[PDB]
Amino acid sequence: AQNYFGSINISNANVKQAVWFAMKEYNKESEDKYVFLVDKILHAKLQITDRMEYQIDVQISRSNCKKPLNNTENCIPQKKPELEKKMSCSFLVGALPWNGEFNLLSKECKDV
Template sequence: MGGVCWRNLLLLLAALVLVAKLGHFQRWGGFQKKSMSKKNMNSTLKFFIENYNNVSNDTYLFRVDKLLQSHMQLTTGVEYLVTVKISRTKCKRNSTKSRSCAIQSNKNLKKSFTCDFLMYTVPWMNYYQLWNNSCVEV
């Protein structure tokens, strides 16, 4: 019985090596500059800005002002490496109308950041995880 088990294991290993040699395993090529689908972009940016606003100590909410750059990489989900410009809005943190907040026009209250963030998503499961982000005032 032990010999049959080893033989089956060796046959399975040989089949895996053959499949790999024939190129049936896709190699992940790292981050590529590709635009996100509109749906994925909106949900990814929404998750990022909600996370940013939740940890920010600012009195006002921020919103994504402009998508500057996006790179993606396919893994077990999708990883996005994104650069955005975010700006302070006229809405305070306790506001319920965060989607329609206008960008701050008062020159004493204006504030913008350029943010780079790395996010892991499984869009078909509506799963998002912010792995890293850094923002610099502009």
């Protein structure tokens, strides 16, 4: 049905910043002991209202990095089968990206 969301390039620096922001907040809010990182950015859509709203679909996986990330470098996807975890997530990120203002409005993740 009709809405005011339009597909947007995933190349866009603001989409990448929206994903950076969403994943920072996802990890802070999650009850998992491990950091999830981005396997792939799958799709992005933009709604223009009083703010910019990015609806972003990402594939994320459980890393071998324990929260909090701190200065840990080269986190890799879990290699232990019992800890391997892949999810498809949809994030709704509100922004005035020209003002560096981002807000995670909604999250939904499913196992894949």
